[PDB]
Structure formats: structure tokens, C-alpha cells
Design a protein around this nucleic acid. Sequence first.
RNA 1: CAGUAACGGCGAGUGAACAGGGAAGAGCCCAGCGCCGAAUCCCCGCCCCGCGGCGGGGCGCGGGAAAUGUGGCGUACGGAAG
RNA 2: GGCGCGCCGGGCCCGGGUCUUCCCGGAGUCGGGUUGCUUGGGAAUGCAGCCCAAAGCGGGUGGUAAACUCCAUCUAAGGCU
RNA 3: ACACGUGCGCGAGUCGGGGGCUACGAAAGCCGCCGUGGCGCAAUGAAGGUGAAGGCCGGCGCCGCCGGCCGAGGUGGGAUCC
Lengths: 98, 201, 102, 147, 203
Amino acid sequence: IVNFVHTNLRKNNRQPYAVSELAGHQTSAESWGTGRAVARIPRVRGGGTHRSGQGAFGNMCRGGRMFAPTKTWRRWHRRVNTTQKRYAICSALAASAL
Amino acid sequence: APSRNGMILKPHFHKDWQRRVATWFNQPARKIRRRKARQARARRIAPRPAAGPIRPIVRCPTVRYHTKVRAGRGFSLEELRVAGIHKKVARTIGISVDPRRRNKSTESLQANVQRLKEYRSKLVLFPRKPSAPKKGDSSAEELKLATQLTGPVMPIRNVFKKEKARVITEEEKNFKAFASLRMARANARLFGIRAKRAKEA
Amino acid sequence: ALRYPMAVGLNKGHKVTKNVSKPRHSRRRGRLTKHTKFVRDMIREVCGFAPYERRAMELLKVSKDKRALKFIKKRVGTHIRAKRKREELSSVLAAMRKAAAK
Amino acid sequence: PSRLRKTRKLRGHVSHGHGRIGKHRKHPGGRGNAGGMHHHRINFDKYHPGYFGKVGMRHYHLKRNQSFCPTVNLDKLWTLVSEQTRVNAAKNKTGAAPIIDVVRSGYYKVLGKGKLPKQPVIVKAKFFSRRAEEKIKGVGGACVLVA
Amino acid sequence: GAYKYIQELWRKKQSDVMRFLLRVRCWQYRQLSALHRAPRPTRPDKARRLGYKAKQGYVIYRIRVRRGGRKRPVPKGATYGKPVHHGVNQLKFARSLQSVAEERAGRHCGALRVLNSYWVGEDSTYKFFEVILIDPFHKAIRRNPDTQWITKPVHKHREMRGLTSAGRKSRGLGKGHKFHHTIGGSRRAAWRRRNTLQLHRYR
RNA sequence: CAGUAACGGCGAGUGAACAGGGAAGAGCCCAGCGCCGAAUCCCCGCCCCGCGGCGGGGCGCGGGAAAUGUGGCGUACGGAAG
RNA sequence: GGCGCGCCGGGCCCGGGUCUUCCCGGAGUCGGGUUGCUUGGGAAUGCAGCCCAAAGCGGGUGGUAAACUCCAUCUAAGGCU
RNA sequence: ACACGUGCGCGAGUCGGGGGCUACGAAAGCCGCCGUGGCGCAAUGAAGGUGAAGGCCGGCGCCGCCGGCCGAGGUGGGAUCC
């Protein structure tokens, strides 16, 4: 119970983290498609820069968006039954005696 | 596609719901803000009850809750009249007034009149210029012993009256509770059509 | 032969004595004032009757009050509003026959 | 715990436990409750009989507060009033019955499920079942109505 | 008072007296421009009710609104969609012609502030409205505690935000069982509360 | 409350309200009706304070708006007059 | 910058209860028909166009169209916070 | 969101999750006249609604109701216990 209660309550003091909602999606990228001997990845729109025709969307693409971007509405916090929280303090106290 | 026996279930997630996800990381910051703004309000009203003005004893509507009593918007103008408090003076000594509240019963009225009698007795009233008391205020020895009341002033507790064990009479034994209810139903249901055919006769 | 208060039936609900507080002042809105009667009576002389009222008169004159009700019901809107209107145009028409012979 | 999950054990496989022949494609039966009368008829018949069709009368502005009638059985009738009353009634000679206001404890209708211990009661309920009344009378008690 | 006689006279619009007045004016108004200053309220009485007083800084613009529904502005009736949105002819505008009048007055008179407005005549092609406008910077209004609410920057362009009486009628706000769809500030605020996941930190 | 009453090729899906507990809590003003000699307000000139939120007090058959209605009393909880 | 002691500047020259006598309301708007959109609102929740168009013991609401009544409950078509 | 399995707490209850009270701490602790409320403790009918053991012995070979006492089935198989 002491482990169970400690390892649910310690999650409650925990600040959210998330990747930005726009990360990897601030291109106007579009797949070239078949017939171009290239792998149907959304490529960046043309122009004499290094990015032009690279690979802009997808977990695997450099730049790109991560797979399943981390949200701030992850269930961060855990609630423990008051009776269980009590029966963790009791235990934690009685262990200190010996 | 449904696997086997499972619940038939319809998530409401077909709209762009992720744009409008309200998170509650504010929650402890909100509670700190509300508590600081409550302490800050309570300090501004130095002697006055922190909770706000007295509310009336009020029955809850609809059959589910009419066994309960809750605090109201404010005292009825006819609850204030019998108490003998001018509706514009009431608000200045910390008495909630709503002119919308009727009074259908004498019990609800007299409960809320007696409620205001208790308030007007307990209430210590400070003079306007403190250095010279005038005729319609509280004495200077009471003014020094006047300090805030925390939580709702005269809190409205719901109380059921004590009854002792009665010897059961033969009337109470002979009374057919179930038969009486089923008669009552049919009488209320067949009141209009009986009276329709008394007309025909 | 003691009855009990019952949550159902003919005279149902909790035992409550009913206090007679004066009815609210908002309840008397639309109640016809002696002065404002005079003003609508005044402008009735000045303005007269609408073309749909004048036709409603001339169906009540020939005695066709159902066809006058069915007329006004189309014009003015509902049945309660029409039944009132007809009984006002029956009042100011029967009042002309009083003024007619004398 | 992501480490306890199945996805960890499926690193190094190929199909990821989803079939080599019948690939893990996106929505190969339609989305949600699709095809309940067509290609999913047998699931909705074998497991959800009654799902399709109208039955009964519409009631437009239904207010759940009106039909509110929390029921107490006779078997748990003596839990509404303290165990001291059950004791002192049986001791006391008078034949005086303690009053059980079923409405105070937060119930309206008294139904008649269990054996009621043989001592007089005055049950102040709003409604009664027939059998509930008969038991209270049978034990030697009164059924007071209230509103 | 004369105003009650003027009030009940304006309620008899089918009477010979008011039919003549509503026709000779509704003539007069057509020959003027669609947005011109009236030198006084055409109905002094009605303007009294709507909050117009007869003091310096109260302005009154007679503005005409072209009459009828709202046909969909789509090239050659081609709404390139599903047959639901094929509608182009029998469509109606969400705000009344009176509210469209108040906001043609309020836009043109960008400095002034639209208090309220009243009907003064309708041809088949044109409705005519007087719009009551107030100077928030005239010292008659600016030093009157009764009217120094319009002198505050919250009440810029009430007509453009449906805050005048005529604009409020389009919004479907009001108390009770008929006006559930605008619980909260507005129709948009109602929708927002109902279409938000409250994801509580614990849950 | 409530994925509820209801909506819906009554399919897919959609879908509030009241009561109840709390956060907060605060009420009010006209027109009309009528009374009070327009009892009201704006702007220019002078003088004296006086303010980088042009405000206060004098002085003037100085001007103007306003009876096609300004101000005070008064607004549904009723109000006014004696 | 915000609060209080005391002197002065000029506004402000005000209450309550009982008793009679008087007074009292927002119209091309409610509402109706129809049309289109809208809504969980279903013989029409809301909004709007056009047509019709009030009343004053009236008018609105009382989640099934309608007539007859009985009740309950608010006073719309003006404003601020 | 749901289902089932498993672990833990309490158990005809259970749960504050919302609100409130008192560096790490946005934590933790507390409330009980904050259990409002959820889900469970009752079902069934479209609905009005109704809503969950009996036998025996006597007062009038069989009586409507007077009382009296014991009183929540039976068979079969059943780990354990005697």
C-alpha cells in the first residue's frame, strides 16, 4: 500500500509537458506522387533553398512532426482513496518504531 | 466493428473537440486567487460578517426536495414589513431583500419574520461618525466586543421535530393505507367524467 | 374516521394555511383606466375604423356573425382575439341603432 | 507503465501482432456502429436484441424530479431509526410503538420484502405497497400517510 | 398629456388620417437620399419612449433600407455543394431591416453612437427608419450622469454588435424555456460551453 | 442532472433544460402618467483661484438649444397629492 | 497612491407609519398565415422575409393541433450595472 | 467510453473528483449540517401504475374474519467438517 500510495501521489506534484501543436505542420508540403522516382513523402514546395523538395510531414522525416505529439491533457494526476492514504501513513509510522 | 458481446456506445468526438479541451492546471491557482480575494474582501468589511448578508429560510421547489430548506435570494417585502424594517434600510444593515418572493403560507412567513427578529437583536450597529453616538445605535461597551462572524450568518440547519412512542389506537390499526391511496387515485382521475354525467342526468 | 394528508388524490399536498397578502401591483397592468378609456374613445372619433373592421360591421349588419368571426379570425389572428373584436364591433354597431331612431 | 504493455514485447516481430495476411488496415468494416442492419446484423441480433425500431410514447419535457419516489423495503425499515429504539420498545411494557418517518431518512414508498421483527411500528410513509401495509398490520402496527 | 393621444393615433395606421400621413411622407422620403439627417424626430412621441431627449448632442438620421429577403451572392446561382445548400432565392437574413438601418446610420456617422430606432413608413421596395444617435463628446451628454454610459468606450458601435434593441431581437436571447440555445452571453457562448471537454486534473 | 427528455434515411449520429450543491452575489433608471412660472442645459467675454484628467466661484437686456418638452419628484417591489 | 483625526470651502435643506382621494405604462409591435434558415424542441425552439395585423379584468407563458372553460405565473415591444 | 481479468481499500454501502478550510508545496493534510451528487441497495409495464414465503390449531366435513404459536422452500450430487 505504501508503494502504491507513494507512486500515485508523487504524480500529483508533476507539471505538464507537451510538444507544440504546430511542430512540423508549418510547411505547405505536398507529395510529388508516383512517376518521380521518389518515396511519395510530402515534399516542401519548390524554391532555391535546401528545404525545397525534402520531406516535411511524418515521424520519420527530418524537421517533421513526432509520432503522436505529447498533449497537456495526458492524465497527469492520480486520486487515492482517503482510507488508503491513511493506511499508508499508518505503516510508514509503525515501520519507524522498529 | 463490434468484436462480440460488448456495450453499444456512441462517443461524442466527431467535432474538432481538441481545439476546445479545457484543462484544469488553473485549479489550485484559481483556489489560491478565490481564497486571497475572499480574505481581501473579509478584511475590507472589518466588523461585518465575511460570508455576506443573512438569507431567508426557503423551501426547495418540486416534490423531490420540498422536505429540505435552503438559503434564499433574499427576504420577501412582506417578511420585512411584519418585522418592521424599511426595504431600503434593510440592505444597509446587511439583510438580503428580493421583492420577487411571494408568501403563499403563514408558516414560511412567520419563520422568516422570527429569523429577522433574531438578527435585529444580535446585530451590533456602529455609529456613522464614531466619536459621537446617536440615539438609534448600539452601546460603546458592545462596540469594543464586535468582531467578524465566519461562515453563513445564522446558518440554516434542517431540523425534524422529536416524537415519543405512541400507543397505537384502533382508528390507526383499522386505517387502510393502500386501499385509501388507490381510491384517491381513481377519484381524482374520475372526477371530471362523473360530473359530466351528473350534468346529463 | 381520521383522514391523513396524501401526496395524491383530490385535495392533496402538505397542510398549509394560506395568508391573504395584497395582489402584486404588476397584476393590474392592462386594466382599463378611466382616463385612458377616454383617450381611445377620443381617437376612435378622430381616426374611425380600419377597412377590415368596416367589412366586419357590414357582415354583422346583414346578420352573418359566424362569417364575421371567420373573417376577423383570418384578419386579426387567433380565435380569442377575433371573438373579442366581433363583440366590440357588435357593441359599437348596436350603439348606432340606439342613436339611429333617437 | 509503457514497459508492462504488449507493444514492448512486439519489437523485432513484423506485423506487430496484427496479421501478415489480413494487414492492420484503417476501418475495414466502416466506422463506429456502421452496418448494424447489413454486414454487422448478426452481432446486433445475437447481442443487442431490440436495438432498431420505435416502441412506447414520447414524453417531451420529462422532469425526473416529478417521478422521484425512493423506495425502502420492510427488511431494512429498522435501520432508518437507531438500534436503541428497537431495544427499548421490546423492553417497555406500555405497548407504545416508536414512529419511523420514512420521509425523514429520505424514502417515499414502503415496499414489503422481508420479515419485520414482532413489535408495533407507526410507519409515517408517503406511499405504501399492499403487502408492506399487511406486514405492518400483521406485526400489530399502523400505516400513517403523510405529504 | 398630448403624448398618449399621439401614441394611440399611431396605433390606427389603417385609419384614413394616418394612411394619408404614412403615404404623403413615404412619398417625400423616397425623393431624398438613402441616408440623410432629419432636423427633428418625425415621431417626437416614439423617440421619447426609446430614450431620445430634446437636448444638444441628440442627432436623428432618417435612413431607408431596400426591402425584401436576402438572395445568396453566388455567381449564376451555382452553389457548388450538396442539394441542402443549393438554396439561393427564398433565403432570409438573420437580422431585421431595422437593425440593418441602425448600422448604416452608425457606420456613416462613425463618431456618433446609435441609441435606438423606430419605423416611419414602408413602400413595397423601401422601409424607412429614423435612427436616434448621440454625441459621446458633447458636454450636455458628457456631464449628464444619466447619459454618460454611452460616453464610455464599451458602447462604441452597439449597432455593429447587436446591442441596440433591434439587434438584440436577431440574437434569440431572453429568459426561459424558449431561449435555452443562447444560455450564457450568447448563441456562440452556449455552443462553446456544451462543445468543450472539461478534462479535470484528477478525473 | 446526463449521454438523460428529445432529435434522427428513428440509420449513422445528434442532444439540452429544471430542480439540487457550490464560486460570486448588487442592484437599478427612463418614457408614459401628473405636478412645480424651463424650476433645465450649452457656448462665448471679463475677474479670481486653478488642474500635463479645463474644473470651481463672481460679472454681464452676452448668445444659443429647449413647450415638436429640459430639469426635480416618480417606475410596477406600486407611485403621488393633501 | 490608498485610509482617519481636526479646521475651513460651498453644495444639501431631505424622514416614517397609519388614513382617505387620485395615477398607473413601451404598436407596423405583439399575435396570425406563409416562406427560408435554425434548434434536442417533436401539428413548427429560435431568427428573418413578405402578407395580415391587435387588445386592455388586457397581453405572454403553462414542451400535442383545436374549442369550451378553470387555475397558476410573469408583465413584452425602452435603458444601465 | 466500455467490457472482462487482476491488485488494493472500505463494505450495504462506497467515492470529494467540485467547492471550502489550513523552497519542495500547483503537494500533502482536513471538512461531515460540504454526500449536493454518482454508481449500488428493486424490479416490471408503452403507459396510468403496481412493486418481491407461508402453514397449522380454535372462536362463527366446509366458511369472509377473531386470535394462538413455530415460522424465509424441496429433491439429487457436493470440497470440508461431525
